[PDB]
Design a protein around this motif. Sequence first.
Motif, mmCIF file in Angstrom:
data_model
loop_
_atom_site.group_PDB
_atom_site.id
_atom_site.type_symbol
_atom_site.label_atom_id
_atom_site.label_comp_id
_atom_site.label_asym_id
_atom_site.label_seq_id
_atom_site.Cartn_x
_atom_site.Cartn_y
_atom_site.Cartn_z
ATOM 1 N N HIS A 49 0.845 -1.178 0.000
ATOM 2 C CA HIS A 49 0.000 0.000 0.000
ATOM 3 C C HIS A 49 0.887 1.237 0.000
ATOM 4 O O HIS A 49 1.694 1.399 0.922
ATOM 5 C CB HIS A 49 -0.891 -0.029 1.226
ATOM 6 C CG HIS A 49 -1.848 1.104 1.323
ATOM 7 N ND1 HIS A 49 -3.012 1.168 0.600
ATOM 8 C CD2 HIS A 49 -1.807 2.225 2.070
ATOM 9 C CE1 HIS A 49 -3.652 2.279 0.906
ATOM 10 N NE2 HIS A 49 -2.933 2.944 1.783
ATOM 11 N N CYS A 51 -0.170 9.085 1.910
ATOM 12 C CA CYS A 51 -0.992 9.770 2.903
ATOM 13 C C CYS A 51 -0.958 11.297 2.845
ATOM 14 O O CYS A 51 -2.005 11.896 3.138
ATOM 15 C CB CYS A 51 -0.635 9.289 4.313
ATOM 16 S SG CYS A 51 -1.075 7.615 4.665
ATOM 17 N N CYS A 101 -3.225 11.592 -0.381
ATOM 18 C CA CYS A 101 -4.496 10.891 -0.420
ATOM 19 C C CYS A 101 -5.603 11.822 0.026
ATOM 20 O O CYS A 101 -5.390 12.736 0.821
ATOM 21 C CB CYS A 101 -4.473 9.655 0.472
ATOM 22 S SG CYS A 101 -5.914 8.642 0.380
HETATM 23 S S1 SF4 Z 1 -4.344 8.297 3.513
HETATM 24 FE FE1 SF4 Z 1 -4.574 7.229 1.583
HETATM 25 S S2 SF4 Z 1 -2.630 6.097 1.219
HETATM 26 FE FE2 SF4 Z 1 -2.738 6.686 3.382
HETATM 27 S S3 SF4 Z 1 -3.578 4.899 4.482
HETATM 28 FE FE3 SF4 Z 1 -5.322 6.297 4.018
HETATM 29 S S4 SF4 Z 1 -6.105 5.590 2.061
HETATM 30 FE FE4 SF4 Z 1 -4.046 4.677 2.337
#
Ligand code: SF4
Lengths: 117, 123, 240, 692
Positions: free
Chosen positions: D95, D99, D102
């Motif tokens: 993954h 962040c 996102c």
């Molecule tokens: S912010 Fe986006 S990349 Fe980060 S854990 Fe949440 S969904 Fe996943």
Amino acid sequence: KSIISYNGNTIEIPEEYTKQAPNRDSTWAPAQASKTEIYKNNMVRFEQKDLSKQPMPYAGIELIAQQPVRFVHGNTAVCDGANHNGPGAQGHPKIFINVDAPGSHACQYCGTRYEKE
Amino acid sequence: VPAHEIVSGAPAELSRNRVVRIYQQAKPATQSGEYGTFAWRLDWDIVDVANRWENDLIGWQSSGDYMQATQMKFTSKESAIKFANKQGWDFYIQEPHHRKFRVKQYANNFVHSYGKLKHIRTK
Amino acid sequence: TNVETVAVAPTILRRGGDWFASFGRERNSGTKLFCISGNVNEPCTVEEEMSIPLRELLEKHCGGIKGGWDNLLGVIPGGCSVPILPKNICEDVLMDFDALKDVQSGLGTAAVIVINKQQDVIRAIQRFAAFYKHESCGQCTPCREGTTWLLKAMDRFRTGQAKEREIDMLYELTKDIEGHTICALGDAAAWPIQGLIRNFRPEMETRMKKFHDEVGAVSVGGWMKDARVEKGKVVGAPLP
Amino acid sequence: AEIELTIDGHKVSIEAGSALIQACEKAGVTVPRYCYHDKLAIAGNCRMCLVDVERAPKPVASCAYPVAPGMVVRTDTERVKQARENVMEMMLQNHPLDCPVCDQGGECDLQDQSMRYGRDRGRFTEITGKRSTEDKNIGPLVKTSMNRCIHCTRCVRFANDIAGAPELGSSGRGNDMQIGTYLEKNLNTELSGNVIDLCPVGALTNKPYAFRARPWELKKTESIDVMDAVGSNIRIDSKGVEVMRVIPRVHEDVNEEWINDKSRFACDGLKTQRLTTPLIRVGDKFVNATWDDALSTIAKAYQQKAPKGDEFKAVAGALVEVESMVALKDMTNALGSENTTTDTPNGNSAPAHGITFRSNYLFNSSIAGIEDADAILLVGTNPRREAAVMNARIRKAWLRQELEIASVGPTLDATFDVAELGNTHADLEKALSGEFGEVLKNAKNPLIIVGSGITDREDAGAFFNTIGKFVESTPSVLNENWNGYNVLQRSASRAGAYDIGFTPSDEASKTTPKMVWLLGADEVAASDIPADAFVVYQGHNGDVGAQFADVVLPGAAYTEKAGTYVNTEGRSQISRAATGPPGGAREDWKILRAVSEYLGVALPYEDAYEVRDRLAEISPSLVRYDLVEPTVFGDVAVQHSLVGPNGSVTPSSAPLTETIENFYMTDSISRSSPTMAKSSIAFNKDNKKNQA
Ligand code: SF4
Ligand SMILES: Cc1cc2nc3c(=O)[nH]c(=O)nc-3n(C[C@H](O)[C@H](O)[C@H](O)COP(=O)(O)O)c2cc1C
Ligand code: SF4
Ligand code: SF4
Ligand code: FES
Ligand SMILES: [Zn+2]
């Protein structure tokens, strides 16, 4: 040159200061507020003031388009954004770009386009 | 019921002009947690002219309404009502909405269809 | 039902249950086709009794081992999804369910894949882990996300780009897949790694010391001190 | 009928055969999960809800392990904590580090459960590293960034089951599984903006609200949705003068967690072409003006035209508040003219069914009641377009049960399976006599849905004659404990307008007006208003209807005001105001209350509570918010709506047409948004949308 300041009065600024930057004429966002709107909105306080010592710092959307496109033999193109003269962790977090579609895929942190070949 | 609006130091205009709302916060549709959905929030309905307006200068969200940021948490519904009419406020109360219990089976997913299938599951 | 246990069904209804129950031990009864393959002298497929010794199985009906009983590095009873029996254990072991469950292993399909001493076990189990990465359906997250990690670790351990602790790590990342999946493919992909770590730890340490004195020392994840991410790919490290 | 077991020492009783995670939710025990959802099927993909169960060797998945008696469940076992740390570490190793970029920063289910249950550090540090997934262009409404997908199947399960769009799926094995259309096919459905609240990670996300704001900044406000029949519940997120997104809060009766496409993405048109000041027409050009200028121009033009009676038309529109209709109806009736019409074609007369007896024009079975149905038929409607959440209800009940459908009208492409009956009132009456008298008389809980598109037809009363005779003759469709005649209403105002009595008389339909008032009322044509007439348009943004006006007056839209709204079911619900009206717009009833003072009318209210008292004087089921009452007058109402158009209207052979031309651009906000504007072209019949 002459833009209307809400009253029919034309105000006159040089053409080098209506650009968003000396890289780029136009705006790079749907709410970028072009310079003619800015001088139209508050010219009350650009009075008696030098326009040249205002900052006007080199829009970055054009300095990234002139960088070349990197070519990767593999499937995935991995990216840091780091320097390697610097002693530490600089640049952005490492992200891995899939280059499979036609065209060149950009890094979402740095904008460097990568292409599979 | 005792009336404490004259001894709290709050102005008269807050108690006579502003309507307030008690509500339980809804479960968010984005994430599946439910932790912020137990305490009863107290929050003030906005004023038409006084809420927010864009600054001429920069674009700062400037306000004239001062209770817009305050928000209270209560344990029970009765405690919120008792406090709200104890301070002399006009309130509206919003009833919570829970989900209906429906029995789920995994073995529902593939039951034998005697007639037309009328669906293709995929998993 | 398996095709063999259905193909045994008419004769066992004809000959009777008392005749079939005489072969093998008390709970493991009867006979079985054994597929003896790998590096034996003569690969074959026989049908013989359960609870029989492995030495009398390999010696009496498949030539022998290519090089003799000295030339036994390991044996895999059953398919890919079984841990390896090492050399001193597999001398007096019987081929039923009990004597292999007692040595923490499985009878499985009773394929006998012996491994030559001149062959490498690490290359073998790297190939097994690549098999389970290719063949997983990819539905549940620990199996699918796990056998890709097992392949990325076994390629690295075959080259030797690791620290002494990362195979204790690989034991733990076997244990976290092992029992949290839908089918037993995650259970299956756990087991040969676990048998490798239980039986051939110095065989892995030897390869790792070999990599440590051929070229420079290595950090976690296979990274070397020269290794840096340039444009596109990673250079400085030989990319296992 | 129930089973008693033990979780965490707690003793709990739950209905038999349920899932174990419903027993954990009932007992208050918090169990983390990624591929379970209340409105979706059960899958055991994500492996997160493992749980220690006595008499089980392995930790079993709590979402698909059924409830048995004598059950002892423990969730705080060291083995369960180890299991959650393990599965969480497994999720995080492919993954990507997105962040900061996102869109689900403070909202990510993967992220908040990684603090609470996951490992501290990460051991993923290979040189080869994570996989990378190709981006997949689905459509203009959904931004799609599939590196950060966890393959929870939740979008696929939903678009299979409820949306009825089977274009999504999962193609591949191993890490090379993807979640998308295989061909790069564009996804349509009427609710495609609901898959982006459903994905727990941010792989499917909002395209107009791509990178604009951020959930710790947003102020949430619980309001009611106009531009929908059902009046679904929303959640408005505001920065404070702007409005960012609406997102559905749950109510099991009105929408059941799932909300329209058009309701969701019309926040773009809330802020793009608004009216912020009054404008007075000079002749071929507007000028903007003072309030006193506009309102005194209205008073001077009233004194110049002098409509003494039946010549002050006041037509309302698609989205209005009930309280603004109180204001307008009070102003026209204290003026002395009940030329007080609604916007639709054939809105100039009484709408062929009674303002009398509320059960004439309402959805009389509950919206919760359509789940109980056996064999239902619709006339003259497309419930896929209008009230697209009702289509989810019909397909869901049709999928779980034995339900039988046919349709009378245009050949609709439902998600579910209809039978065809015809395109004629003769085809209607033939189908009622031939097959479905027997079916609807046989069935226990049937119902009949009537579109309001045939109410707007001039041949309306023939349809209501035939259906009223059938409902009165058949005792199964109408009895004591439930009611089976049902109608749908396109706009959120029409049910409130029919509650208040906002309808013209037979005398008022004859004259031509000298002064017309448009309150909303966007779908007026050029020919509907007279050329000599002094029209004034009160509304929140510029439109077709604002272009015809001699004066326009800005109003507050549904976000900027607190308002009562009445849906097809009959619920009165309040919208809370999120932001204030920008520039110089005011609330809608205050403007009419102030225009009255320049005329001869002093409206008896002047504050917001006195509006509520006047509203209780009109009917006290409009201060009784979010309650549904039954109707004891169900028998009398069908007869009283039968007697009226008996023989008065002859059924002409004009074929039954589609009610709305497009889905996406049907009112004043949706036609102003560029999101619907580039949506309706991309959700037109292309090769990317053809199933082939
Ligand atoms: S912010 Fe986006 S990349 Fe980060 S854990 Fe949440 S969904 Fe996943
Ligand atoms: C990944 C996986 C692969 C399997 N492949 C086979 C196979 O190829 N042939 C077979 O007979 N059983 C195979 N099995 C076992 C089957 O589940 C088997 O049909 C069942 O468990 C037992 O069947 P039986 O009673 O005939 O022994 C497999 C199991 C798993 C989890
Ligand atoms: S264990 Fe089996 S079912 Fe589960 S993800 Fe792996 S291959 Fe699929
Ligand atoms: S696309 Fe989204 S909802 Fe669908 S399986 Fe992937 S992450 Fe889950
Ligand atoms: S939610 Fe139960 S395993 Fe995915
Ligand atoms: Zn980069």
